[PDB]
Paper text:
Subsequently, Pro156 was replaced with His, termed P156HAfFer. To elucidate the detailed structure of the 3D protein arrays, the high-quality cubic crystals of P156HAfFer were obtained, and subsequently, its crystal structure was solved at a resolution of 2.50 Å. The space group is I23, with unit-cell parameters of a = b = c = 229.16 Å and α = β = γ, indicating that the SC lattice was yielded by P156HAfFer. As expected, the introduced histidine residues formed two pairs of π–π interactions between two neighboring P156HAfFer molecules. Additionally, two pairs of electrostatic attractions were formed by Lys93 and Asp94’ between adjacent ferritin molecules. Although such electrostatic attraction is also involved in the formation of the SC superlattices, the designed His-involved π–π interactions play a dominant role because wild-type AfFer cannot assemble into such SC superlattices. Although the adjacent P156HAfFer cages are not aligned along the C4 rotation axes perfectly, the dislocation angles and distances are almost negligible relative to the entire cage-like structure of ferritin, and thus, they do not affect the overall SC structure. Additionally, in their SC crystals, the C4 rotation axes of adjacent P156HAfFer cages are not aligned perfectly, while the P156FAfFer molecules are perfectly aligned.
Residue numbers in the entry:
A (entry chain H), B (entry chain E), C (entry chain F), D (entry chain D), E (entry chain A), F (entry chain C), ...: 3 to 169
C-alpha cells in the first residue's frame, strides 16, 4: 500500500544488485586477508581492501533499505565465492578491483536505464545520488592507483606505495 | 528576460502544486488540533501533525520561490477546507495522511514527467532533489506508523505509540 | 463536560475569526512572494511579509487552541485567495496591509462585544490579552510605515526603507 | 483611608471564595494521601494531587492578600472536611476534581459578575488575571486526563498513566 | 487612517490624565528635594520620592504613547505647581501622597468607566494592565508606611524608618 | 581503461564548455578591473565581479576534473578576450552578465541534452548537481540586481547599491 | 588628472605583461590537470602547478591594479592556449616551467629597462618590489627541483618527489 510507481522488473533488478554488492564485498575481504598472509605481508593493502569490503557491504544495505522503502520485497541469493583464491602482486589485485568495479558500474547503469523505461524518476535519482558518481570516483581512484603502482615498480616501490598510500 | 527553457505548461503545473501543498498543510492542521480536543486528547499526534502542517507549508514556499526563480508567475487559488472535520482514531488519521501523501506524490511524479517532456533538466532535478525522495521517505514512515498502530492495538497501545513514538 | 459559560454564538465567532486569521496569513504570503519576483525584487518586504504570514498563522492556532480549551468544536472553511494577484509599490502593499488589519481588528471587537453580551468574562480577557493590543500596536506600526514610505519617495527611497527597516 | 471603590458585597464574596479555595486545597490533600495508601499505591497521583493542594492553598493566600490590598478585612470560617474519605479509581478522583474546579470556576465568575455590577474595574481585572484563565486551563487539563484515563483503561493503563503522566 | 473605535471624549480624557500624571511627578520632585534640605535632611525619603517622581513621569509618557497609538492628538497644558512648598514630617508627606494617589486612582477609574461607555475594550484593558492594579499596590504601600510611621513614632524612629525602609 | 559509457562527442562538449567558463571568468576579470578605474571607481562592483571571475574559474576546473574522472583528454583553445573593454554603468555590466550567464546556461543545457542522447546517466546528474541549479540561482540574482539598480537610478542610487549590496 | 610621470610606452608594456602573466597562468593550469590525468596520476605535481597557476593569475591582477593606480587603461588580449597539450615526465614539465619563468623574467627586466629610460622611478621600484626578486627565487626553486628530479630518477624517484616535495 506504500508501493507506487515501482515496477516489478525494477524490483528484481534491485534484488540482483544487492547480491552483486555482497559479492564485491566478499571479494575485497578475500583480497584483504590475502594481503594478511605472511607470504604476502602487505599491511596497507590489507587495511585498504578491508574497508573496501565494508563499504560494498554498506552499498548492499542501501539497496536493501531502498527495496523496503519502495514497497518491494528482499530476496537474497547465494553470495558466490570469489573468482580467485589469491590475487597476485599488489598491482594485480588493484587491477582485479577495477574490473570488478567496472562490471558493478555497468550493472548500475543497466539498472538505471531500466527504471528509466518504467518511468521511475525517484529510483533513477536515488541511484545517481548514491551510486553513479561514487562508482565513477571509485574507478578513477583505482585507475590512478594502477598508474602509480606501475610507476614505482616491483620490490621497494610496492612496499612504499602500500605503506605511504594505501591506508 | 530571466525566463529560459521554462514552458507555459510547466509553470501552470507548479501553480497547482503550490495549491496542493497548501491543501496538505491545511488538512494536517485540522488533524493536529483534532488531537488537542478534549474528547480525543492525544498530545503526541497533535505535536506530530502540527510539525507535518508546518512542513507542507515550507514545501509550498519552496515551489513559490521556484516559480519566481525560473521567471514564472505565482497564481494563487482558494485553499479548500479539508475533507473531514474529525479524523477518528490515531491510526485512521495516519491512514488519511498516507492517502494524501500518495496523492501528493502522484501529482509530483506527473509534474516531473511533464517538465521532462518539455525537456527541462533543471526542473526535473529540482523536483527530484527537494521532493521525490522526501515523499518516498515520508510514505515509508507513514506505512510503518500504520503497521505499528495495528500491532499496538486500541486502548493502552494507542496512547503508548502516541506518547513514546509521535513527538 | 468541560464546557462552562461558553455560548454557541461565541463558538461560531471564534471559528470565523480562525478563517479570517488564516485568510490574512495567505494574503501576506502572497505579498511576501510578490516581493520575491524579479520584476519587484524587494528582499526586505519579502522577509517582513513572510514573517507577518507566520504570525497571523500563529494567531489562527491560538484561536484553535482556545476553541478547544473552552469545549468548543473547530469547523474549518475554505481559505479564500487574496483580493489581488499583485500588490503595486511597497507603499501600496503596506497600505493594503493596514486595511487588512483594521478589518481584522474590527471583527475582533465585534467578537469581543458578544462574548461580553453573553457574560463570558474569560473570553473577553483572553481576546484582550492576546489580540486587541497586539492589533493596536500593529496598526500603529503600519501607519508609521506608510508615513515613512511617503516620506522617502519612490525609487531610491523605496529601496532604502525596504533594506534598512523591513527585515 | 486606603479603601476606595471597594464594595462591602465584593468584600464578603472574597471571604467566601477564600474558604472555597481552602476547601479545594483540603479536598486535594485527602486525595493525595489516599493514593499514598498501600491498598492504592499510586505514587504519581500522590505527587500530582499534593501539588494541586499546594496550588489551591496558594490561591487562598492570593485572595487574602487581595482583601488586604483593597482595604477589606479577612474573616475566616471552618474548612469543611472533604466529601469522601476514599476516592475510588484514579479516573474516579480526576473526574471528581474536574467537578470541584467546575464549581470553583462558577463561584469565581459569579464573584466577577458581582464586582462588575458594583463598578469595580480593578477587581474584575484581578480575578481575570489570577484566576479565570487558569481555571479554564485547569478544566482543560483535567478533561484531557480523563480522556487518556479512559483510553489506557484499568490495570496496566492506570499504572502507566500514574507513573508516566501524573508526577 | 489608524484611528479606530476611539472616542473624542476618551481622547480628551487621556489628555487630562497626562496632565495629572505630570502634576503627580512634579509634587514628588518637590517632596524629594524638601527632604534634601538641611532643616529636614531625610535622605532615604529623598531617594524614595525622587523615584516616585521618575515613575509618575513614566506614567505620563505611557499615556502619551497610548494617545499616539490609538490615533489621538497629544494636547499639553501647564503643569501646576504642587500644593505645598514644604511637607512637614515624613508621615505628613506620605499622607499627602496617599491623598494624591487616591485622587489619581479616582481619575483613572473615571477614565475606565468612560472608555467603557464608549465600548473601547482595548482602552479598558490598557488602563487595567498598566495603571489600575499599580494604583492599588501603591495605596496599600502608602497606607503600610503610614501605619509604620505612627508605630516608630517621632525622632529616632523617623530617622530609622527613613534610612532602613525608604531607600 | 577507466573510460566507460563516456561518448566522444560529450568529451568534445566538455572541452568547449571548459573554454566557455574560462571566457566568462575572463569577462568578469575585465569587468572587475574596469570598476577599479578612477574614472569608474565602484569598489563594490570591483569585489563582486572579481569574485564571480574566481567562481567561473572554478567552474572551468570542475569541468576539467570531470573530463579526467571520466577517462577523457583535456584539449584547450585560446581564451577569447572579452567583448568590450569598458562596461558602461553598473546596470549595464549587470545586464551584460545576465546575457553571459543565459548563454552559459544554454550550452550547459545543450551539453545535458547531448549526454542524455548518448545515455550518459552519470554525466547528466553531474551537470545537474554542479551547474544547472547554480545557473538558475545566478540568473535570478542577476535579474534582481538589475531591477534594484533600475529602482535606485543613477547617481547616489548607483553608489549606494554598489556599496551596500554588491560586495 | 591622476596621471603623472607615466609614459604611454610604459603603459602598453604593462598591458603586454598582463597578457604574459595570464599566459603563464593558463599554461600552468594545463600542467596541473595533465598530472590529474589517470595515465599520469601525480597528485603532488597537480597540487603544485595548480597553485602556480593561481600565483600567475594573481600577478596578472597586480599589473591591472597598477595600471589603474598610475592612470592608465587596461586593454585585454586573447589568452593564447599553452604550447603543449601534455607535458611528459614530471622533470619535463618542471624544466618547461623554468623556461616560461625565464622568458617572463626577461620580459619583466625589459619592462624595467623601459620605465627607467622614461624616468619612472616609482614604476621601476614597483617591478622590483613585486616581481624581480620573486622571479629570481622562482628560478632558484625550479632549478633545485630539476636537480633533485634528476637525482631520484624515473619511477620510484618520481613518485617520491611528487608526494614528498611538490605539494
Amino acid at each position: 500500500t506504500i508501493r507506487q510507481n515501482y515496477n516489478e522488473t525494477s524490483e528484481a533488478g534491485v534484488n540482483k544488485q544487492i547480491n552483486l554488492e555482497l559479492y564485491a564485498s566478499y571479494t575485497y575481504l578475500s583480497m584483504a586477508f590475502y594481503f594478511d598472509n605472511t607470504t604476502v605481508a602487505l599491511p596497507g593493502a590489507h587495511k585498504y581492501f578491508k574497508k573496501a569490503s565494508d563499504e560494498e557491504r554498506e552499498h548492499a544495505m542501501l539497496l536493501m533499505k531502498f527495496q523496503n522503502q519502495r514497497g518491494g520485497t528482499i530476496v537474497l541469493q547465494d553470495i558466490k565465492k570469489p573468482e580467485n583464491d589469491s590475487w597476485g602482486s599488489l598491482k594485480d589485485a588493484v587491477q582485479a578491483a577495477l574490473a570488478l568495479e567496472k562490471h558493478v558500474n555497468q550493472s548500475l547503469l543497466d539498472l538505471h536505464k531500466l527504471a528509466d523505461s518504467k518511468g521511475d524518476a525517484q529510483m533513477c535519482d536515488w541511484i545517481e545520488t548514491h551510486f553513479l558518481t561514487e562508482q565513477v570516483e571509485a574507478i578513477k581512484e583505482l585507475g590512478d592507483h594502477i598508474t602509480q603502482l606501475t610507476r614505482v615498480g616491483h620490490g621497494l616501490g610496492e612496499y612504499t606505495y602500500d605503506k605511504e598510500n594505501l591506508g
